[PDB]
Amino acid sequence: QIVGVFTDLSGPAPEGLQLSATIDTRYSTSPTLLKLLAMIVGVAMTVIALGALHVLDCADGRRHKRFLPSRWWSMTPLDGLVSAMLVWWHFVGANTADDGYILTMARVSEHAGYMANYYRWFGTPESPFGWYYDLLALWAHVSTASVWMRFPTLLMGLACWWVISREVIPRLGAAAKHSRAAAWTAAGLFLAFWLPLNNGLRPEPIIALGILLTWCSVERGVATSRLLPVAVAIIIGALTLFSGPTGIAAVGALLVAIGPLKTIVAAHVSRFGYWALLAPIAAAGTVTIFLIFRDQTLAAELQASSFKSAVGPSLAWFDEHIRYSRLFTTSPDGSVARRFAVLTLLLALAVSIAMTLRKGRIPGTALGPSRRIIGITIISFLAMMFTPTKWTHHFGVFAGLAGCLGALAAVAVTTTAMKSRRNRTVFGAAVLFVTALSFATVNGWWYVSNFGVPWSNSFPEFKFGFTTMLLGLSVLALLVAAWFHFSGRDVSPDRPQRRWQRLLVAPLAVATWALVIFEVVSLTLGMINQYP
Amino acid sequence: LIFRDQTLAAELQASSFKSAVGPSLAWFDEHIRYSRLFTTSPDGSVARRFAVLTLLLALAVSIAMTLRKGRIPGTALGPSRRIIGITIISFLAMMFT
Amino acid sequence: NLRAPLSSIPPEATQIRLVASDDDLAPQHWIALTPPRIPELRTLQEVVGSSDPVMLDWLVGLAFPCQRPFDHRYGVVEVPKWRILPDRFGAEANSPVMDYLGGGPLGITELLLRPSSVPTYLKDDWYRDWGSLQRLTPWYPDAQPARLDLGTATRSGWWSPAPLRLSH
Amino acid sequence: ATQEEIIAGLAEIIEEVTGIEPSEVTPEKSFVDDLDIDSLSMVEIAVQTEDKYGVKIPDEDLAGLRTVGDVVAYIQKLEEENPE
Amino acid sequence: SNHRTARLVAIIAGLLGTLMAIATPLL
Ligand SMILES: OC[C@H]1O[C@H](O[C@H]2[C@H](O)[C@@H](O)[C@H](O)O[C@@H]2CO)[C@H](O)[C@@H](O)[C@@H]1O
Ligand SMILES: OC[C@H]1O[C@H](O[C@H]2[C@H](O)[C@@H](O)[C@H](O)O[C@@H]2CO)[C@H](O)[C@@H](O)[C@@H]1O
Ligand SMILES: OC[C@H]1O[C@H](O[C@H]2[C@H](O)[C@@H](O)[C@H](O)O[C@@H]2CO)[C@H](O)[C@@H](O)[C@@H]1O
Ligand SMILES: OC[C@H]1O[C@H](O[C@H]2[C@H](O)[C@@H](O)[C@H](O)O[C@@H]2CO)[C@H](O)[C@@H](O)[C@@H]1O
Ligand SMILES: OC[C@H]1O[C@H](O[C@H]2[C@H](O)[C@@H](O)[C@H](O)O[C@@H]2CO)[C@H](O)[C@@H](O)[C@@H]1O
Ligand SMILES: OC[C@H]1O[C@H](OC[C@H]2O[C@H](O)[C@@H](O)[C@@H]2O)[C@@H](O)[C@@H]1O
Ligand SMILES: OC[C@H]1O[C@H](O)[C@@H](O)[C@@H]1O
Ligand SMILES: OC[C@H]1O[C@H](O)[C@@H](O)[C@@H]1O
Ligand SMILES: [Ca+2]
C-alpha cells in the first residue's frame, strides 16, 4: 500500500536511487474521437429511428393525442395540503442517511475525471449507476445547502402528486376518478412514503416517479395504439433502472410493458413487417448504453462491479428477508414512519388482489390500468430481492405505486364495491392493526435529523402506548364485525349517512393522513424543542 | 385439572412474575419467529423453512381459490371453510406466545 | 470534557471549589481530573474553513455543506487536514464503510496521518454528542505533494492493466 | 343488428375501458357530459371495436357521436356493406 | 406504395442505433 515514499535519511541523493511506481491510472479516462462519434451519431440515429416510428400511427390514421399531451392543470384544497406537506417537509423534515455520501461524491466528481465511489471499493466508479450524480455535481455549482440540493427532489414530489392525481387516477376508472376518498387515500399513502423515505439525494425519488412515467407512457400508448409511447416508456424504465442499484423495481413497470407491446405491435402491425416496428424500440432499449458507458469502458465497469461485490457488502436474492427483518427493529429503519408506509401498501395491495379475485377486477375500476398497477407493484416487490444491500430506506421506490394503490384500495373498500358491512368492518380492523404494529417502535429518524423529535428513541405513548390503544380498537372493530356476521347488517340500516360515518368508510385516508400529520408535527416539534 | 394442586393465588402470582423475570415478548414481537426462520441455523433449517413456506403456499392458493370461485371446486362448503378458518386464526393466535 | 454552562453560576459567585467524592471499592469505578477552564470557543466554520481539504465521514455531509472534502487527482488523493465525524455510536457502527478492508479513505489516512482530537461543543445543546472533530497531522511533515509524471496513452475496450487487489 | 345488441356491445367496451356500469349505457346519455368519458377513453373504445369487431371510425366520427344513441345510428347505417 | 417511405428509414436507423450502442463500450 503506497501513501508516498518515506525516508528518515537526508542530504544529497546518489545515482542508483530510482523508485518508479505506475499509479493505477484506469477509470481516469476520456472518450476517443471514434467512441464520441458512435455516441453522438448513434443517439441521433435512435431519434431518427424513433422519428420514423412516430409517423407510423399518423400513417395508419387518427387525430393527434387527445389527453396524453397535457391534462388541464390547476389547484384543489387537497393539492394545496399535499404541496404544503411537501414544501414544509423540505425545511422542517428529516432527510435520507446517504444524501451526505452522494453530495461529497458529486462534489469531488469533476476534478476526479470520473464518478468514483469516494468512500469505498478502492476508488472504483459507480460504473452503470448514478448518472444524476453528474447532474447533482453541476447543481452544487449554484449552492450546497440541504434546501438547494434537495430542491429537484422537492419538484419531483410535486411532479409525482401531479402524475398520480391527473394522469394515474383519471385512468384507473370511473369510481377512482369520481371518489374523493380515492384521491385522499392516494395523497395520504403517497405522502406516507415520500416524506420519511424520499427527502434527499438518494435515487428513490427519481425511481418512484420514473415507475409512474413508464406506466403512464405504456397506459397512454396502449389506448392510442401508438408504438412511440411504448418506446418512450422503455427509455424512462432504462434510465430509472441505472438511477441506482435499487433501480430494478423499474423492471416491474418494464415487464408489464411487454404484454401491451405485443398487443400494440400485433394489432397495428397492418402488414408493416416485424423489422419496421421493432428495430426503433430495439434502439430505444440500447439507447441507455450511450449514457451508462459515456466515460467508462466495458472491461472497466464489469471488472469494477465484480470487484465491488467481492470486496464490499453484497447480499443474495434469498437475503431479502433482512430488508423486512430491519423494518421490524426498534431503530430508525424500523421507525413508526417506515413500518406504516410498507405495512399499509401491503394492505392496499392485499385488498386489491383479494377484490380482483372475488370480482373480475375492482368494481368501479378500468380493467387494464388497475391490473397493470397491481402487476407493477407485485413484480416490483419481487424484483427488489435482487438488490446487493437490504435497507428499509429503499421502500421509497414504492412512493409512486403507493398513490395508485391508495386510490384502488379505497375504491375496492367503498360501500358500493365491498357490499358486506362485516367485510368492511374487518378491513377497518386490519388498518387499525397495521397502525397498532406501526406504533410498536421509535419515532426515530436518523442522524442529525433525530434532534429533539417526539419519541425519537421511545414507543409513542400517551397514557398506555399507541400500539396497545390501536390493538384494542382493532379488537373492538372485530367484535362489531363479528356482531354483523350474526346480526346480518347492510349499508343502509346500521346508521343514516352522516359525516362521521362517511369518514369511517375511508379508513386508509384516515390512517394515512393521521400519520402524514404526525410525522410533519413530530419534525416541526423537533425544531421547536431545539429552540436557539 | 389445572388448579388440582396449586391455588388461584399460586398460579396467578407465578405467571405475572415469570413474565417479569424471564423472556417475555409481546404480540408485536411475532416478527422475530419469522426473523428466526431465515437464520442460517437449526431454527431456520431447510426442514423448518420448507414446512412453513409450503404451508403458506398451500393456504395462499386455498384462500386464492375460495376467493375466485365460492369455495375450492370439488370440496364441501363448510368443512373446507372451517379448516382455512382455523389456520388463519391459529397463525394470529400464535402472535400471543 | 465534563461540561456545565456559565449561566448555571450566579453573578453572586466569584470563587470556585472542585469537589469530587468517590466510594466504590470495585476495581473499575474511579475518577481522574484537571483544573477548570472557560474555553476560548470559535465556531467550526471560521476554524476549519471551506478551502482546506477535509475527511468528511459519509454520514456528516448535508450537515457540513460549506467545508470541502479532499478532491482526488489521478489515482492520488488530496491529504485531509481535518476529520468531521458523527456521534460515538454513529461512527462506532458506520465508520467501517471506509475501513481498509472496504478500501475507503479511513484506510489511507490510517497510515499517512496521526489523528489528534480537538474538543468541540454543540451551540446551546451543551450535553448532546453532535459528533467529533479531528486534526490530521502527517507523520513526516517535511514531506509535501508528489512529483506526478503523467502522460496521455489511448487504450482498448476489453483492456485491463493489472488485477484489483482484495484487502485480506 | 338491433339497438340492444349495439348498446350491449358498446356497454362491455365502456366497462372495460372506463369503470362505467353497462346500465349507464343508454341512448339519452352523452359521453363527454352525462357519462364523463375522457378524450383518451374514446380512442381506446374506438381501437377496441377496430380489434374485436373490425370496425373503424377515423375522420373525427368520435366528435360527431355525442350520445350513445348517435353511435347506434352510425353502426346500424354500416350493415349495407354485408360483412356478416 | 403501402407507406414504405418511413418503413425503410425505421429499419436502417433502428438496426444502426442498436448496433452502435452495443459497439460503444468495446470502443
Ligand atoms: O454492494 C453494493 C454495491 O454494489 C454495486 O455493484 C453491484 C453490481 O450492481 C452488480 O453488478 C454486481 O454483481 O455486484 C455489486 C454488488 O455490490 C455497486 O458497487 C454499488 O453501487 C452498490 O451499492
Ligand atoms: O451461497 C451460494 C451463492 O449465493 C450467491 O448466488 C446467487 C447470486 O448472488 C444471486 O444474486 C444470483 O441470482 O445467483 C445466485 C443464486 O443463489 C452467490 O453469487 C455465490 O457467491 C454464493 O456462493
Ligand atoms: O419518556 C420521555 C418521552 O416522553 C415525552 O412525551 C410527551 C410528548 O413528547 C408530548 O407530545 C406530550 O407532552 O406528551 C408526551 C408524554 O405524555 C417526549 O415527547 C418524548 O420525546 C420523550 O422521549
Ligand atoms: O403481554 C405483555 C403485554 O404488554 C404489552 O405492552 C408493553 C409494550 O412494551 C408497550 O405496549 C407498552 O409501551 O408497555 C407495555 C409493557 O411492557 C402489550 O400491549 C400487551 O397487550 C402485552 O401482552
Ligand atoms: O417466558 C416464557 C414462559 O412464560 C410463561 O409465563 C407466562 C404465564 O404463564 C402467562 O400466563 C402469563 O400471562 O405471561 C407469562 C409470560 O409472559 C410460562 O410460564 C412459561 O412456561 C413460558 O415458557
Ligand atoms: O448508490 C448509493 C450509494 O449510497 C451508499 O451508501 C450506503 C449506506 O447505507 C447504509 O445505511 C450504510 O451501511 C451504507 O454506508 C453507497 O453504498 C452507494 O454508492
Ligand atoms: O362476495 C361478494 C362481496 O362483495 C362484497 O365485497 C362483499 O362484501 C360481498 O360479499
Ligand atoms: O397491558 C399491559 C400494559 O402495560 C403498559 O402499561 C401498556 O402499554 C400495556 O397495555
Ligand atoms: Ca473508586
From TrEMBL, chain B:
**Localization:** Cell membrane
| TM annotation in the entry | 46-67
Q: What does this protein do?
A: Arabinosyl transferase responsible for the polymerization of arabinose into the arabinan of arabinogalactan.
Give the family from UniProt.
Belongs to the emb family.
What's the name of the protein? Integral membrane indolylacetylinositol arabinosyltransferase EmbC
Q: Which residues of the full protein are shown?
A: 472 to 568 of 1074
UniProtKB/TrEMBL annotation, chain C:
Subcellular location field: Cell membrane
Q: Which family does it belong to?
A: Belongs to the emb family.
Q: What does this protein do?
A: Arabinosyl transferase responsible for the polymerization of arabinose into the arabinan of arabinogalactan.
Q: What is the protein name given in its UniProt record? A: Integral membrane indolylacetylinositol arabinosyltransferase EmbC
Protein source organism: Mycolicibacterium smegmatis (strain ATCC 700084 / mc(2)155)
Gene assigned in the entry: embC
Which residues of the whole protein are included? 908 to 1074 of 1074
